[PDB]
Structure 1
Amino acid sequence: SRTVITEVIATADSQGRFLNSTELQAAFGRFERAVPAIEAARALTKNQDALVKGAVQAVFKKFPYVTQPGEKGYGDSNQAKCARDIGYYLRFITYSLVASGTGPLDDYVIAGLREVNRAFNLNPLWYIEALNYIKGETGKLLSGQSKTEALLYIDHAINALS
């Protein structure tokens, strides 16, 4: 993955050197901030189902034609598969909160995202709106710095989609 710790270790290894004070400073900052990020992760994991269902409904509201019969969104399977995709995204946001870096997001979601979306005719705008709704609701759920870290990761995923 690409955490702070792992990026530190990899950049030290590539240069073939030990970890001098700068990488340890970065690691210290990461360990100091682990508490707010884990707090955000536990808040997102607590309000999991509500966030997923709200995101799906927001996607439908901004994309009414997607609900039309004989089309991509219509069908119980495609509703369930929307819910599954948003669950995946939220899972990986919590993963990146815990790992205090966009490691899991880049590894799973973003890596290869563009061409698999192209090969399935999945509009990125759907997931962009879902993530915008999750951002809006986590504004309500999370107060303080957990809010900031979460919003950083949701915005990173949004940038990757857009």
Structure 2
Amino acid sequence: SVVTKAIVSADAEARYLSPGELDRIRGFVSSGERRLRVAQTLTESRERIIKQAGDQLFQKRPDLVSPGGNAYGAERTASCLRDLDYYLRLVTFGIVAGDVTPIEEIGVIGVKEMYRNLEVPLPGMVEAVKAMKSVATGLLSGDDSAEVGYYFDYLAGALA
């Protein structure tokens, strides 16, 4: 998180946190309630988000659910929807943490090897993430939508 990054930075220099690192922690702590409200808004609407995101993905990319596609069939489509649910939960984790570190440690490190083994096309993951970003940021307020769009953007850049 923000606190973890500040402490790792201070420890890597073998020193107490500077005024800058304490300012980072202080600004993070002040924003905690808004972060929880955002993450709770996303959590209560998890099923609607995943359903609409899957709909936009499969409309924009019918070849994914067409015969010969990676997500063809009910089981493979359900596993695609399950992966979108994973990444939405990871986005909420990142929001409460104030940084993308939970996202990286659970769903980005080794992701390209995993989807290479699964033959899941990474471009399709990118438009799935962009779809889920549009759907999720639609539910939030203007100030909050940009902040969570940053997490979705990081995850999309990590898949690409």
1:116 maps to 2:109: no
Structure 2 unaligned spans of 5+: none
1:48 maps to 2:46: yes
Q: Which residue of 2 aligns with 1:18?
A: 16
Counterpart residue type for residue 34 of structure 1: G
Q: CA deviation at 1:70?
A: 4.7
Aligned 8 A contact 1:55 1:134 in 2: yes
Question: Higher relative contact order at CA 8 Å, sep ≥6: structure 1 or structure 2?
Answer: 1
Aligned pairs (5 A) from 1:137-152: 137-152=135-150
Q: Which residue of 2 aligns with 1:135?
A: 133
Change in CA separation of 1:141 and 1:75 when aligned onto 2, cut-off 3 Å: same
Aligned 8 A contact 2:58 2:65 in 1: yes
Aligned 8 A contact 1:36 1:145 in 2: no
Aligned 8 A contact 2:137 2:148 in 1: no
Give distance in 2, aligned partners of 1:94 and 1:49.
14
Aligned residues: 160
Counterpart residue type for residue 149 of structure 1: E
Give distance in 1, aligned partners of 2:102 and 2:145.
19
Structure 1 unaligned spans of 5+: none
1:154 maps to 2:152: yes
TM-score (norm 1): 0.92
TM-score (norm 2): 0.93
Counterpart residue type for residue 32 of structure 2: A
Q: Which residue of 1 aligns with 2:72?
A: 74
Q: How high is the sequence identity, in percent, across the aligned residues?
A: 31
